[PDB]
Amino acid sequence: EFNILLATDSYKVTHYKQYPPNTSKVYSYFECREKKKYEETVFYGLQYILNKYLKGKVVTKEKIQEAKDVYKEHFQDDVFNEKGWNYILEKYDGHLPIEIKAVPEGFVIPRGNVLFTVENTDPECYWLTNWIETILVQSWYPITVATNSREQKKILAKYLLETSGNLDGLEYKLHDFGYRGVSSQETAGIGASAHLVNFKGTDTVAGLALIKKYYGTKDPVPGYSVPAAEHSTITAWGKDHEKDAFEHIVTQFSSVPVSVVSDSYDIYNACEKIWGEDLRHLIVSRSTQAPLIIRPDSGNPLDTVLKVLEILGKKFPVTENSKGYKLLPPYLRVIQGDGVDINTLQEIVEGMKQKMWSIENIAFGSGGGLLQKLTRDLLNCSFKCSYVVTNGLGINVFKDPVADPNKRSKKGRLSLHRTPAGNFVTLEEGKGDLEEYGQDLLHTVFKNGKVTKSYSFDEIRKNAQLNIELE
Amino acid sequence: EFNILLATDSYKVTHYKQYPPNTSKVYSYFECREKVKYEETVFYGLQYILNKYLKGKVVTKEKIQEAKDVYKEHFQDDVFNEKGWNYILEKYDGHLPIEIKAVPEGFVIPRGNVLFTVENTDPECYWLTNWIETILVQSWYPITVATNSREQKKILAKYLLETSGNLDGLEYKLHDFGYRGVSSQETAGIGASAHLVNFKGTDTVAGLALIKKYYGTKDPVPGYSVPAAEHSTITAWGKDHEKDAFEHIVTQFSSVPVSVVSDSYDIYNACEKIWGEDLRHLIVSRSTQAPLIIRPDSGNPLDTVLKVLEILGKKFPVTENSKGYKLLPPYLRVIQGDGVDINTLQEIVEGMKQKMWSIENIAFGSGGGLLQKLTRDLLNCSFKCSYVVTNGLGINVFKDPVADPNKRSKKGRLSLHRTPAGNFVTLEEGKGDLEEYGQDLLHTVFKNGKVTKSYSFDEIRKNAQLNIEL
Numbered sequence: 001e002f003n004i005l006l007a008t009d010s011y012k013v014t015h016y017k018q019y020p021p022n023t024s025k026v027y028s029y030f031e032c033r034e035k036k037k038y039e040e041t042v043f044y045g046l047q048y049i050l051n052k053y054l055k056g057k058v059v060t061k062e063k064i065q066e067a068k069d070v071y072k073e074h075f076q077d078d079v080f081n082e083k084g085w086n087y088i089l090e091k092y093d094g095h096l097p098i099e100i101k102a103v104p105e106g107f108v109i110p111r112g113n114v115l116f117t118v119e120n121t122d123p124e125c126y127w128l129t130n131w132i133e134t135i136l137v138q139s140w141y142p143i144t145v146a147t148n149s150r151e152q153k154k155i156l157a158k159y160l161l162e163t164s165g166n167l168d169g170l171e172y173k174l175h176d177f178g179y180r181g182v183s184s185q186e187t188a189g190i191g192a193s194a195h196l197v198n199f200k201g202t203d204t205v206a207g208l209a210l211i212k213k214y215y216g217t218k219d220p221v222p223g224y225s226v227p228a229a230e231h232s233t234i235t236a237w238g239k240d241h242e243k244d245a246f247e248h249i250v251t252q253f254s255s256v257p258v259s260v261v262s263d264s265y266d267i268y269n270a271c272e273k274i275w276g277e278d279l280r281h282l283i284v285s286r287s288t289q290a291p292l293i294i295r296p297d298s299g300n301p302l303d304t305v306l307k308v309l310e311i312l313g314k315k316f317p318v319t320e321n322s323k324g325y326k327l328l329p330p331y332l333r334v335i336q337g338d339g340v341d342i343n344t345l346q347e348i349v350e351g352m353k354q355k356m357w358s359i360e361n362i363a364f365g366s367g368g369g370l371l372q373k374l375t376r377d378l379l380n381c382s383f384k385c386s387y388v389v390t391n392g393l394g395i396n397v398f399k400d401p402v403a404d405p406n407k408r409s410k411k412g413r414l415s416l417h418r419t420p421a422g423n424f425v426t427l428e429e430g431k432g433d434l435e436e437y438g439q440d441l442l443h444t445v446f447k448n449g450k451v452t453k454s455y456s457f458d459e460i461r462k463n464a465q466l467n468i469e470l471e
Numbered sequence: 472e473f474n475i476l477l478a479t480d481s482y483k484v485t486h487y488k489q490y491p492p493n494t495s496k497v498y499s500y501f502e503c504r505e506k507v508k509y510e511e512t513v514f515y516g517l518q519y520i521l522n523k524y525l526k527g528k529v530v531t532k533e534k535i536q537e538a539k540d541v542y543k544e545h546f547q548d549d550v551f552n553e554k555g556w557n558y559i560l561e562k563y564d565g566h567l568p569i570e571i572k573a574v575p576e577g578f579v580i581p582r583g584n585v586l587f588t589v590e591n592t593d594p595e596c597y598w599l600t601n602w603i604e605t606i607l608v609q610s611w612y613p614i615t616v617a618t619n620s621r622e623q624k625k626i627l628a629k630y631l632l633e634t635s636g637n638l639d640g641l642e643y644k645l646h647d648f649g650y651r652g653v654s655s656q657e658t659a660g661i662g663a664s665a666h667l668v669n670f671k672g673t674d675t676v677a678g679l680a681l682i683k684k685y686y687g688t689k690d691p692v693p694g695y696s697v698p699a700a701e702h703s704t705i706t707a708w709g710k711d712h713e714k715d716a717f718e719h720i721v722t723q724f725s726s727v728p729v730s731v732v733s734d735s736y737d738i739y740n741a742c743e744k745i746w747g748e749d750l751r752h753l754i755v756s757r758s759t760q761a762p763l764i765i766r767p768d769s770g771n772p773l774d775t776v777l778k779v780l781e782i783l784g785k786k787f788p789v790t791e792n793s794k795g796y797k798l799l800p801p802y803l804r805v806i807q808g809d810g811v812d813i814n815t816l817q818e819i820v821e822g823m824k825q826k827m828w829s830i831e832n833i834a835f836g837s838g839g840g841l842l843q844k845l846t847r848d849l850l851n852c853s854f855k856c857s858y859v860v861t862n863g864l865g866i867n868v869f870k871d872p873v874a875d876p877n878k879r880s881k882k883g884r885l886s887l888h889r890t891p892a893g894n895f896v897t898l899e900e901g902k903g904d905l906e907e908y909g910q911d912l913l914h915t916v917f918k919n920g921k922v923t924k925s926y927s928f929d930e931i932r933k934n935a936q937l938n939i940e941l
């Protein structure tokens with residue numbers, strides 16, 4: 001069973017001996033720190049953490065003893081605030097005396113702004129604010145996945161609109177392939193849910209249950225998939241029978257969209273000779289609602305996509321849309337799902353546009369790039385103490401390392417506001433109390449063991465929309 | 472509760488309809504596919520997956536019903552193999568009819584060798600082998616953390632040996648700071664455990680319970696930490712009282728080692744004037760078993776470490792060890808825990824060596840670099856079907872994409888062997904049966920719902936030792 005007393009960085013066990021004596025309040029904040037691009041971030045994921053790990057009775061006698069036992073061996077020493085944890089158990093029935101205020105989930109906020117704050121609500125528990133830094137900071141992951149996914153949606157939107165004149169089906173243009181490529185089952189669920197803030201297409205099934213349990217949607221599920229082959233289901237037919245494999249699969253899935261990986265042996269032969277000739281008659285007969293999607297999966301992503309389109313364009317009746325771009329017949333599409341990340345995505349759609357191919361023809365799948373190839377320093381997600389009360393006097397605190405101004409932290413009690421021009425500003429040093437900048441956008445989401453404000457996944461999606469969708 | 476029917480890539484739900492008719496056997500293997508860095512990998516982590524996710528009754532009526540209902544909406548259609556999963560429920564009390572063979576955990580194996588194989592043990596369950604691909608492939612993560620961690624140990628061993636003449640304390644030279652910097656609590660435990668294959672220092676507490684539950688050690692815990700400050704415990708004192716914080720902290724932890732982050736405002740002032748002058752009397756009085764560890768945390772990692780050492784070297788009595796390298800007194804050490812990954816680790820120790828500073832003086836902490844900044848394509852960890860039986864005939868299968876020879880997969884039934892020169896070789900096409908290369912080195916680790924072979928964490932550590940250690 002999960003034990004919050006064992007869910008922190010080891011050294012934090014020792015911090016109650018280190019703060020100034022007579023400290024009654026430790027107040028800390030989280031930001032995606034600005035760096036001398038990712039200029040705005042999607043705030044998403046805290047609600048999962050609050051419900052799964054922080055709310056309710058999270059301290060018991062048994063958990064205190066278990067922690068005591070582990071730390072004794074781990075430190076080879078008795079450092080451990082047993083009295084501190086006992087207090088929480090006795091006074092608050094094991095509920096955390098903490099208040100957390102946060103910007104609404106889905107909000108899109110420029111770098112360098114307060115996203116949430118944390119403070120103890122009982123003077124005895126000054127040490128608890130930063131005990132839970134470690135667990136709260138892990139919100140960097142769904143923030144970064146949601147943000148990186150949204151940035152890719154921006155690229156797709158721009159090129160889809162330019163080459164086709166609209167944004168139809170944009171929400172299905174980037175599919176989550178990342179399940180096998182992440183570091184754990186829990187990560188899979190979290191990462192997949194964050195991608196679903198921006199898109200509807202996913203094969204990472206774990207995301208669905210997480211959304212259902214922690215956020216909720218009006219619709220039965222937040223994400224969808226389609227039948228698709230893998231190399232095993234083609235190669236199992238044997239090298240000489242790729243055509244048989246292709247024919248069997250498209251016939252089994254005759255009335256729904258189906259994707260077929262076509263690069264097992266020779267992607268170009270597959271497109272030109274197998275799909276383009278031998279099996280052409282099984283393709284041109286398909287419904288617009290059930291296209292064949294040809295999937296290359298190797299080689300230079302841009303070069304391969306262009307060559308595949310060139311091949312298909314000569315075997316199938318291509319049209320020219322109102323924007324002047326080439327368009328495959330509606331029963332035929334392509335998906336590139338190898339080596340796609342935000343950089344290569346950009347390179348492919350720009351390459352397609354140069355060669356006069358509509359973005360309508362293509363979709364993208366991304367695995368490692370979408371859910372795993374990300375770190376906390378991408379957006380500099382960071383949690384820092386900015387205000388303490390010692391001997392009844394509040395003081396504004398911060399770090400400001402001499403060799404790295406990028407690492408300076410904010411001072412005092414913080415609040416987030418709309419500017420007169422409608423942008424965002426974070427007020428420091430309790431200046432939000434002057435009430436010159438309207439209402440604080442941070443809301444109490446957690447207080448004394450209770451989740452006090454929640455958002456549906458539908459609300460979050462609304463908050464995270466692109467401007468171009470809004471227009 | 473975990474549901475194995477909902478723990479695969481969506482498209483695999485539809486694969487039982489795509490294999491050739493009358494397929495009775497699907498046989499697949501995992502390798503860290505070949506194609507000068509990372510020439511060998513540490514096999515670690517499969518045992519966790521087998522025990523947590525795959526063994527025992529993993530199928531129930533409720534789980535089948537749940538999966539059916541989810542996939543109906545997810546595909547907007549009925550494609551779920553309800554009958555297949557019901558078969559496993561009724562016939563095997565929900566135990567998976569699968570056999571898995573693997574190299575022992577902790578083994579160090581060159582790239583491009585079979586590490587484990589999976590095949591169905593019931594003809595009705597041909598589809599099951601690749602259903603579980605997604606969960607098994609996640610073994611890439613502990614494999615990769617363990618391997619990258621071990622490669623860093625190799626660098627540290629080399630330079631520690633060169634600058635000091637021995638390897639004393641090597642297993643504490645790279646400390647895991649990665650807890651806040653990974654993607655989840657589960658990943659924290661897995662990754663931290665993987666680092667502990669090679670080292671004993673960690674602040675990622677989640678790794679301890681994982682090892683205790685899934686692997687086991689003779690010792691009470693597999694990993695250790697020491698008291699240390701963070702920025703909040705220094706800055707809380709106010710900008711004008713940095714000295715007061717340092718004094719309080721080292722006095723609270725007077726007889727155990729203690730690290731104190733010293734760069735809140737000015738690392739060089741902290742080292743030269745606060746530690747080096749004002750509080751010097753509290754440092755030189757400390758025990759060899761309870762040093763102060765000064766911790767810079769910003770700026771260019773190599774430049775900062777060198778300047779910190781030069782500062783301390785002028786304020787404290789430095790000696791010269793038998794190898795001719797400079798050594799701080801035993802009550803004083805440094806730890807660099809910012810921007811450390813395998814590349815910068817190399818740069819720092821090399822730079823220290825060039826300036827005649829012993830590696831004894833320094834330790835490293837690594838967070839994101841150790842546990843998060845890693846992907847499945849670093850070692851090309853990959854799972855592929857190599858052998859099927861259809862209509863009672865065995866067929867050797869593989870992929871071989873024309874534009875990428877690096878993606879070619881192995882053919883047929885696989886086995887792992889020792890060569891005459893004592894190396895590893897992977898035999899394909901059932902050739903291990905020819906018995907020209909002795910016994911298959913893979914062991915059956917899972918069969919029909921049961922874990923059939925397992926390793927303690929102590930054995931894994933032994934298997935993963937460096938040559939120089941041996």
Ligand SMILES: O=S(=O)(c1ccc(NC(=S)NCc2cccnc2)cc1)N1CCCCC1
Binds near residue numbers: 172173203365481
């Ligand atoms: O976007 S689409 O072209 C589209 C087509 C096919 C797939 N699925 C694929 S390629 N799965 C293969 C796979 C799965 C997991 C991991 N690695 C590979 C997704 C999306 N599409 C959506 C809406 C209806 C029309 C067509």
Ligand SMILES: O=S(=O)(c1ccc(NC(=S)NCc2cccnc2)cc1)N1CCCCC1
Binds near residue numbers: 011649699766804834
């Ligand atoms: O290797 S050591 O120098 C050494 C010193 C200090 C720490 N801990 C530190 S700096 N924690 C700070 C921190 C924790 C978590 C995340 N981010 C930062 C580890 C190791 N060491 C070991 C053996 C006995 C003597 C001394």
